[PDB]
Amino acid sequence: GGVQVGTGTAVESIVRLHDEYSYYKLKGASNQLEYTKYMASTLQEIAQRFP
Amino acid sequence: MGIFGTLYTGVTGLKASEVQIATTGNNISNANATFYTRQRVVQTTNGYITT
């Protein structure tokens, strides 16, 4: 007609949050704690093994 | 007989009724798309004189 129609309402195609790199901070942090705690678990354990 | 012409002219006035179908349907159109700005109705001034 005499006026254009932006027609009403619809939905958007789905997506995930922008960033993971924060999650990357954890991935690196895992490996190192994964080192120390595992190393710890073994080492002190061993330290008691042979007192 | 000529007054018969008035009758179809009245129908044109009746077609002015149809727009309010268009307006109500169009106006209702904006479901919650949270980005909309309305479009709204008018009435007109007039004057007519004779010889």
Resolution in Å, one decimal place: 6.5
Structure tokens at B49: 């004189």
Amino acid at B49: I
Do A1 and B22 meet the contact criterion of CB atoms below 8 Å apart?
yes
Contact between chains at A1 and B33 (C-beta distance less than 8 A): no
C-alpha B48/C-alpha B10 separation (Å) is 18
Give which of B35, B16, B18 is closest to B26, Cα–Cα.
B18
Q: Angle B19-A9-B31 (CA atoms, 0-180°, nearest 5)?
A: 65
Distance between CA atoms of A2 and B14, rounded to whole angstroms?
19
Amino acid at residue number A17: L
Best B20, B21, B30, B42 member to test A by mutation, with max A CBs in 10 Å, is: B30
Measured between its terminal Cα atoms, the distance across chain B in Å is 23
Minimum CA–CA partner of A12 in chain B: B33
